[PDB]
Amino acid sequence: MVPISPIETVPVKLKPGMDGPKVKQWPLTEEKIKALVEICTEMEKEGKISKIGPENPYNTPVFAIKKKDSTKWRKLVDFRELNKRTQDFWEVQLGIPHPAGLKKKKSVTVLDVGDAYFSVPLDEDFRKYTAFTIPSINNETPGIRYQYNVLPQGWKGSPAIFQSSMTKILEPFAAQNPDIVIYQYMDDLYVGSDLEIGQHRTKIEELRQHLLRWGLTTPDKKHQKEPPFLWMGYELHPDKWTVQPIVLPEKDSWTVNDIQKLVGKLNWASQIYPGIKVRQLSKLLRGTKALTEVIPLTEEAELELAENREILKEPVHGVYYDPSKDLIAEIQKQGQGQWTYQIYQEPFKNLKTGKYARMRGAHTNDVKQLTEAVQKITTESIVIWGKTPKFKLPIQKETWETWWTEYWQATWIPEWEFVNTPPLVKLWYQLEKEPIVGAETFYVDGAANRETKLGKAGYVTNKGRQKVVPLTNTTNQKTELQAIYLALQDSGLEVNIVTDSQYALGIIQAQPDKSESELVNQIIEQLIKKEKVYLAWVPAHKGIGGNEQVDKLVSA
Amino acid sequence: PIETVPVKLKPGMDGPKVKQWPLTEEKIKALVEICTEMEKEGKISKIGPENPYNTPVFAIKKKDSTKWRKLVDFRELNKRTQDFWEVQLGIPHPAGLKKKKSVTVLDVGDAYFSVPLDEDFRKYTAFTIPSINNETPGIRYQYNVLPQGWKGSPAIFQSSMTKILEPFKKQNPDIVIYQYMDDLYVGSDLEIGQHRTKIEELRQHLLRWGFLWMGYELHPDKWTVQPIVLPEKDSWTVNDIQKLVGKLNWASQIYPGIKVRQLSKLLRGTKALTEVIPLTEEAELELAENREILKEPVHGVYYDPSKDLIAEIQKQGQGQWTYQIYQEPFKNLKTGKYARMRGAHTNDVKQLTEAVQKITTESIVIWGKTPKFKLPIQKETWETWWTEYWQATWIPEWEFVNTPPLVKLWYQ
Ligand SMILES: Cc1cc(/C=C/C#N)cc(C)c1Oc1nc(NC2CCN(Cc3ccc(S(N)(=O)=O)cc3)CC2)nc2ccsc12
Ligand SMILES: [Mg+2]
C-alpha cells in the first residue's frame, strides 16, 4: 500500500434556518427496484455511498431511467429539494476564456479525470442530508437506505467543490512548471506547452506522478478528438480559432421565434465575422412574448439579412494572441446607431471582431456613441488581454478636441489615432458663445392649452419681423420647440435666438445630431444649414422685452 | 490583542456579493506580490468555495509614490456592517479642525494589521484577485486582521489609538487630532517648521508604539460659501442685462428680497442683443440693493448630521471646476472652485477624479463624513476610468448627471 494524501474536505452548511429535505420516495416497479439495487450495491462497493439506519429523518427520491440502444437502467437521485436548501458557493466556473486571448501552444494533451472526481470526499456532517431510499420488493421489508460519501452528481455544490479541489491539488505543479498551462473543463483536463513532443510527454508523466500522490488515476480521453476542439461554441485549431459553422436558414415565413435564433447566431458570429448587423432584425422583436407570431420582414430587415449572408458566405478565422506585439482596435460607423470593430496585432489578421449598438434614448449624437463604443472595447480588452488597445477611430483629431473642450460633461478616450475611413464622425453644428453683431434677434415663444391641446408658436425680432402660427394637438413643450424651429426657418445664415424654454435649452445644450422627435430633427437640420447661431435663455414672465411681447402673442 | 471584538452584520442582511471588475495585467501582478507577502505575514488566508462573498479589489499609487498599493472597495460591506458605538455613544466631530491654520493627513492604516478580526466575521471580507481572460480561477482570500477601508477598523481600534495618542495630546493641548478611516488629520495654528516637526514628532511617537512616512497638508482657512457676484460694468448690452436678470432670478431662490423689476424695465421693447442699454437710476439702485443682499449669508443654513451631504460639480472648461456641498437645495453649506488640476491638462476624467478626492477631503475635515456626488459624466466613462486616477484610501458614493444643468452659468 502506497500512502495517499487525503483531499481536503470543504465544510458545507444548509441555508440558515432551513433543515434537510424530507421528500417521499415514489413507488417503483419491481424491475426498476432490481436495477437500482444492483447499481447501488456496486456504488457501495466502490465507497461512493453507505448504508444507514432508519434514524436519519431525511430523504431524496431516486428514479430509474434508461437509454434506448444502451441496454441498462440508469440511476437518478433528484436533489432538487436538497439544492434549494444548500448554502450558496463560490461558483468559480461562470466565465470561460475567450479564444482571442489564448496564446498558441504547440502541443496539447487531454486527461480524463472522471474517476478523480469520486475521490473528493463529501463533508461528513453534510452526508446525512443526502439520504435516499430504494423501495423494497412488494414493500414487504424496510427500504434500503443509503447516503453519499462523495460529491453527488446533481447536487448544488459538486461542480464548485470538485473544481476547487483539483485546482488546489494542481497549484504546486503549475507553479513549479511555468512552461506549461493547465485548464480543466467538466471531466476533462487540458495541458498545453511549447516544448518538443518529448519533453511535453515527460511533463505529462510528471503530472500523472503528481496526481498519484492523492491516488488519482488519469488516462487519456476516450477517442482522442483530432483538432479542432469543439468547445463552448468554438473551433480551437492549433494556429487559428473560429466559431462553429454559422448557417442561416432559408425561409419565406419568419416567426418571432425564428428571428430570435437568427439574432443569436448573428451575435455569436459577430465576434469574428466583421460587419455583422442586427438592428433591423432586432427591431422586428421590439415587444412580444409569443413566439410563432409570423412577423413579415421589412425591406430593411431583408437587406440586413442578405448583407449578413454575404459576410457569412465564407469561413473566417481569428489569430491567437502574441504578447510581444501591440494591440490595435479599429471602429467603423455603420449607420442607424450601429458600430463595428476589429482588434488585431498585424494588419488583416484579426484576433476578434465585435459590434456596439446605440443606447435607447430620445436624443443622441455620433461622438457620444463612438465614446461609448470605445469604453466597451476598452473593458472587453482588459478582460481578454489585460490591457487597453490603441484605437484607430474615424474622427479627426481636431473634431475630438473641439468636442471635449466644449462639452458640458467630462469625457475621455484613451490613446488613439485618426483613420480616414468614411463615414467620418463629425460635429454637425456648434453654437456661438457670444451674441452675434449684425445678426437679427428672434424672441421666440410658444404656449398650449392643457385641455384643448390648441397652441401657438411664434417670434418677434428687432427688425419688426413677426410670426405666430396656430397649432392643434400640441403641448407647451412642443410649441416651445416649434417656436425655435420657425425662427431658424425664417432667419438668415446668422441669427440670435432668445427663448425662455428650459426644456428646449436642455435638449439643444445636449448637442444631439439625431432625435426620436421629428421636430427636434427638423431643428437639427436647420442648425446644420446656419453659419452662426447664438441661443440665449431668459426667465419667463419677468417683463423681459421681446419675450414679454411674444409671450402674450402666443398665450391666446 | 488576542481578544477579538464580536462584529455582526445588520439584521436580515447577508454579506456582500460584489462582482470583481476586470484589472489590467500590471495591477493583477502588483496585487499578487502584495497578497503573497500579506499571506506570509498572516494578515490574510486563502479561502474555499464554501465562502460565496466578495468585495472588489484594485491597485493604486498613493499621491506621488511609485510602490503599488492595494485598495479594497468595502463600500457594500460598510453599509451592511452593524452601526458602531464601539466605546461611547459617538465621537463628537471636532469643529476646531476646520479652523486650524494647517492640517496634515497621515496614513496610519498599517496599524490595523496588528489587531485580529473576529473569526466569525472574517468570511465577509472575502475578495478575489482576478485572472486575465478567465485563464485560471481567481485567487480567493479573506482577512485575518482589521482591514484598511473597513468601517469597523477605526471603531474596533479606537481604544488602542486613543491610548497611543494620549501622551502626545497631553503635551500639545492645542493640536487637534482627528481620525477618519485609515487617516489621521493633525492640525495646528503654528508656522509649518514647528508643524512638520510636530508631525514628524507624532509619527515617531507612533513608530515606538508599533507609519508610511507620507503626509497631506491642508489649510481649512479659506473654506466657506463663496459669494454670488454680479458684474460691474459701465455699459450693458441687452444680452448682459438678460444674463443679469437670469442670474438674479436664480439667486432669488436662495436670497429673499432680490428684485429684477427695474432691470427688466430697461429691456422695454424688442432690441438687438448687442445693443447698449443705459441703466436708469432706478435700475442702478435695484442692482445696488441686490449687491447688498448678496453680501450677507444665506438664511437658515445648518448642518443636520442625520442627512446626507450632497456634492455637485460643474465642468467650467480650461481646467476649472466649480462645486457646491449642501443637504437641502439652495442651502449651500460650502461652495468652491478648482483650477489647473495637477497632471491632467488634457484629461477631463482625471481632473474630475482629483476634484472628487479634494471635495471629499474637505468634507471629512468639516463634517467627518463623505458626501454623495452628482457627477457631470456618463456612467460608463466614469466607471471605466476613475480607478486609474484614485489615490485615496476611502471611496465615496456617486450618481450621474445626464441633463446639462442651466445653473452652470451662474457659478461661472
Ligand atoms: C489548454 C486548453 C484547452 C482547451 C480546450 C477545450 C476543449 N475541448 C481550452 C482552454 C481554455 C485551454 O487553456 C489554455 N489554452 C491556451 N491556448 C490554446 C491551446 C490549444 N490551442 C488549440 C490546439 C493547439 C494544439 C493542438 S495539437 N498540436 O496538440 O494537436 C490542438 C489544439 C489554442 C490555444 N493557453 C492557455 C493559457 C492559460 S490556460 C490556456
Ligand atoms: Mg411664455
Count of Cβ atoms closer than 10 Å to residue B9 Cβ: 15
Compute the residue count for chain A. 556
User: Are the C-beta atoms of residues B327 and B303 closer than 8 Å to each other?
Assistant: yes
Distance from CA of B43 to the nearest CA of A (A): 20
CA distance A428 to A399: 10
Q: Name the closest-CA residue to atom 31, ligand 1.
A: A238
DSSP string, A339-378: EEEEEEEETTEEEEEEEEEPPP-SEE-HHHHHHHHHHHHH
Helix (H/G/I), strand (E/B), else coil: A49: strand
DSSP H stretches of helix in A213-356: 256-269, 279-283, 299-312
Nearest alpha carbon to residue A343 among A308, A388, A394, A396: A388
CA distance A328 to A263: 27
CATH architecture of A1-92+118-158: Roll (3.10)
DSSP string, A105-140: -SEEEEEE-HHHHTTSBPPGGGGGGG-EEEPPGGG-
CA distance B158 to B332: 32
CA distance A11 to A124: 8
Burial of A485 (0-12, 13-18, 19+ CB in 10 A): buried
- Kindly state the DSSP code that residue A248 receives in the 8-state scheme: P
CA distance B118 to A412: 43
Range(s) within chain B of domains with CATH label 3.10.10.10: 6-95+121-161
CA distance A37 to A136: 9
Does the distance separating the beta carbons of B377 and A89 come in below 8 Å?
Answer: no
Fold of domain A429-556: Nucleotidyltransferase; domain 5 (3.30.420)
Does the distance separating the beta carbons of B270 and A388 come in below 8 Å?
Answer: no
Report the relative pairing of strands B236-237 and B276-277 from DSSP bridges.
antiparallel
Tell me, yes or no, if the two domains A1-92+118-158 and A429-556 fold the same way. Answer: no
CA A25 to chain centroid, in Å, comes to 42
Residue that is written with C-alpha cell 432584425 in the block: A281
Which of A232, A376, A382, A402 is the best substitution to test chain B (most B C-beta atoms within 10 A)? A382
Helix (H/G/I), strand (E/B), else coil: B393: coil
Sheet (strand A390-393) strand order: A349-357, A338-346, A328-335, A390-393, A416-418
Which of B119, B133, B314, B380 is the best substitution to test chain A (most A C-beta atoms within 10 A)? B133
Residues ≥6 apart with Cβ < 8 Å to B24: A382, A386, A387, A388
User: Are the C-beta atoms of residues A128 and A58 closer than 8 Å to each other?
Assistant: yes
CA distance A215 to A209: 10
CATH of A228-321 given 3.10.580.10, 3.50.50.60, 1.10.357.20, 3.30.70.270: 3.30.70.270
Residues ≥6 apart with Cβ < 8 Å to A235: A228, A229, A241, A242, A243, A244
CA distance B141 to B18: 14
Nearest alpha carbon to residue A180 among A203, A210, A211: A203
Helix (H/G/I), strand (E/B), else coil: B248: helix
Count of Cβ atoms closer than 10 Å to residue B165 Cβ: 18
Helix (H/G/I), strand (E/B), else coil: A524: helix
Does the distance separating the beta carbons of B249 and A539 come in below 8 Å?
Answer: yes
Count of Cβ atoms closer than 10 Å to residue A104 Cβ: 13
CA distance A145 to A133: 4
Does the distance separating the beta carbons of A549 and B270 come in below 8 Å?
Answer: yes
Q: Name the closest-CA residue to atom 4, ligand 1.
A: A190
* Greatest C-alpha distance within chain A: 109
Residue that is written with C-alpha cell 473528493 in the block: A120
CA distance B394 to B148: 9
Which three cell numbers, joined as nine digits, stand for A402? Answer: 473641439
Range(s) within chain B of domains with CATH label 3.30.70.270: 96-120+162-217, 218-303, 304-412
| A230 CA → ligand 1 middle, Å | 11
User: Are the C-beta atoms of residues A69 and A60 closer than 8 Å to each other?
Assistant: no
Does the distance separating the beta carbons of A544 and B264 come in below 8 Å?
Answer: yes
Radius of gyration of chain B (CA): 25
Residue that is written with C-alpha cell 442627512 in the block: B307
DSSP string, A190-215: EEEESS-HHHHHHHHHHHHHHHHTTT
Instruction: Please give the CATH superfamily to which domain B6-95+121-161 belongs.
Output: HIV Type 1 Reverse Transcriptase, subunit A, domain 1 (3.10.10.10)
Specify whether domain A93-117+159-227 bears CATH 3.30.70.270. yes
CA distance A415 to A392: 9
Compute the residue count for chain B. 412
User: Are the C-beta atoms of residues B337 and B363 closer than 8 Å to each other?
Assistant: no
Which three cell numbers, joined as nine digits, stand for A38? Answer: 444492483
Helix (H/G/I), strand (E/B), else coil: A503: helix
Which three cell numbers, joined as nine digits, stand for B233? Answer: 460694468
Residues ≥6 apart with Cβ < 8 Å to B329: none
User: Are the C-beta atoms of residues A179 and A173 closer than 8 Å to each other?
Assistant: no
- E strands of A381-463, at which residues? 390-393, 416-418, 440-448, 455-461
Cβ of A170 closer than 6 Å to ligand 1, yes or no, is no
Residue that is written with C-alpha cell 454559422 in the block: A246
DSSP string, B272-297: -TT-EEPPPHHHHHHHHHHHHHHHSP
User: Are the C-beta atoms of residues A129 and A157 closer than 8 Å to each other?
Assistant: no
CB contact burial B269-308 (16+ within 10 A = b; e otherwise): ebbbbbeebebeeebeebbeebeebbeeeeeeeeeeeeee
CA A252 to chain centroid, in Å, comes to 30
CA distance B33 to A91: 25
CA distance A415 to B281: 58
β-pair partners for B104: B186, B217
Distance from CA of A283 to the nearest CA of B (A): 25
CA distance A324 to A348: 18
Residue that is written with C-alpha cell 470593430 in the block: A341
Residue B327 backbone dihedrals phi, psi, to 5 degrees: -110, -40
Pocket test of ligand 1: the residue of A113, A201, A229, A231 to mutate, having most ligand atoms within 8 Å of its CB, is: A229
Does the distance separating the beta carbons of A161 and B378 come in below 8 Å?
Answer: no
A30 is in an annotated binding site: no
A551 is in an annotated binding site: yes
CA distance B360 to B372: 9
User: Are the C-beta atoms of residues B394 and B149 closer than 8 Å to each other?
Assistant: yes
- E strands of B244-339, at which residues? 276-277, 310-317, 320-326, 332-338
Domain map (residue ranges) of chain A: 1-92+118-158, 93-117+159-227, 228-321, 322-428, 429-556
Cβ of B135 closer than 6 Å to ligand 1, yes or no, is yes
Pocket test of ligand 1: the residue of A190, A204, A234, A320 to mutate, having most ligand atoms within 8 Å of its CB, is: A190
CA distance B183 to B179: 6
Nearest alpha carbon to residue A445 among B270, B403, B243: B270
Pocket test of ligand 1: the residue of A96, A103, A105 to mutate, having most ligand atoms within 8 Å of its CB, is: A105
CA B295 to chain centroid, in Å, comes to 28
Instruction: Please give the CATH superfamily to which domain A322-428 belongs.
Output: Reverse transcriptase/Diguanylate cyclase domain (3.30.70.270)
Residues ≥6 apart with Cβ < 8 Å to A526: A485, A488, A489
Ligand nearest, relative to CA of residue A542: 2
What's the half-sphere exposure (Cβ side, CA atoms, 13 Å) at A13? Answer: 7
- E strands of B108-235, at which residues? 127-129, 139-143, 176-180, 183-188, 216-218
CATH architecture of B218-303: 2-Layer Sandwich (3.30)
Q: Which residue of A has its CA nearest to B350?
A: A412
Q: How far is CA A59 from CA A62, A77, A137, A145, A451, in A?
A: 9, 10, 19, 9, 68
CATH architecture of B304-412: 2-Layer Sandwich (3.30)
Q: Which residue of A has its CA nearest to B25?
A: A386
Cβ of A238 closer than 6 Å to ligand 1, yes or no, is yes
β-pair partners for A251: none
Burial of A521 (0-12, 13-18, 19+ CB in 10 A): middle
CA distance A47 to A124: 14
The one-letter amino acid code at B316 reads Q
User: Are the C-beta atoms of residues A319 and A237 closer than 8 Å to each other?
Assistant: no
Fold of domain B96-120+162-217: Alpha-Beta Plaits (3.30.70)
Which three cell numbers, joined as nine digits, stand for A63? Answer: 428514479
Reported resolution, Å: 2.0
Report the relative pairing of strands A363-364 and A390-393 from DSSP bridges.
unpaired
For chain B, count helices (H), then strands (E): 9, 16
Report the relative pairing of strands A440-448 and A416-418 from DSSP bridges.
unpaired
Residue B306 backbone dihedrals phi, psi, to 5 degrees: -85, -10
Residue B54: its H or E element: none
Count of Cβ atoms closer than 10 Å to residue B193 Cβ: 8
CA distance B275 to A87: 76
CA distance A519 to A508: 12
Cβ of A174 closer than 6 Å to ligand 1, yes or no, is no
Cβ of A107 closer than 6 Å to ligand 1, yes or no, is yes
Give, rounded to a whole angstrom, the gap between the first and last alpha carbons of chain A.
Answer: 103
Nearest alpha carbon to residue B249 among A297, A531, A544: A544
Cβ of A183 closer than 6 Å to ligand 1, yes or no, is yes
Which three cell numbers, joined as nine digits, stand for B180? Answer: 477618519
Sign of the torsion formed by the C-alpha atoms of A534, A537, A543 and A547: positive
Cis peptide before A228 (omega within 30 of 0): yes
Nearest alpha carbon to residue A518 among A363, A413, A375, A399: A363
The one-letter amino acid code at A465 reads R
Cβ of A201 closer than 6 Å to ligand 1, yes or no, is no
CA distance A386 to A528: 42
CA A33 to chain centroid, in Å, comes to 46
Q: Which residue of B has its CA nearest to A95?
A: B134
User: Are the C-beta atoms of residues A371 and A352 closer than 8 Å to each other?
Assistant: no
A140 is in an annotated binding site: no
Ramachandran bin of A205, using left for φ above 0, alpha for ψ from -120 to 50, beta for the remaining angles: alpha
CA distance B138 to A91: 11
Q: Measured from the CA of A230, which atom of ligand 1 is nearest?
A: 8
For chain A, count helices (H), then strands (E): 14, 23
User: Are the C-beta atoms of residues B280 and B266 closer than 8 Å to each other?
Assistant: yes
What's the half-sphere exposure (Cβ side, CA atoms, 13 Å) at A124? Answer: 1
